Amino acid sequence: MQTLPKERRYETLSYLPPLTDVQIEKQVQYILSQGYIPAVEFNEVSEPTELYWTLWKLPLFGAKTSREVLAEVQSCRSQYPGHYIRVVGFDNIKQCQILSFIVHKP
């Protein structure tokens, strides 16, 4: 018998325990093997009232393996240690966005 403490618990996939390297790539493998476009985004602060996250280098239109989508975030580990890095997943066609998960946190 206990209450919930007061944390930020950022957007989505954030009340569950923080997703590890296996669960990062399994969701990245869900992006490409379902035909979505794995884009990497970053931002200074991760509240969901700052509405745009700044897009890292490209949205990776022709990304086919998780070993290279994560390897673009490997180029974004050392670049931004203090930014909430995030791999989003855009729909290929029908104008929507599906996956959203922070891969790196300050």
């Binding site: 018998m1 996939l13 569950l16 969701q27």
Partner: peptide, 25 residues
């Protein structure tokens, strides 16, 4: 049985546990 703020965190963890599994096939 623990109220609202546990009763909503139950319905939000169980939401996103099912969205986590859905985003892993």
């Amino acid at each position: 049985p623990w109220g609202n703020a546990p009763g909503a965190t139950a319905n939000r963890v169980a939401l996103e546990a099912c969205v986590q599994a859905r985003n892993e096939g």
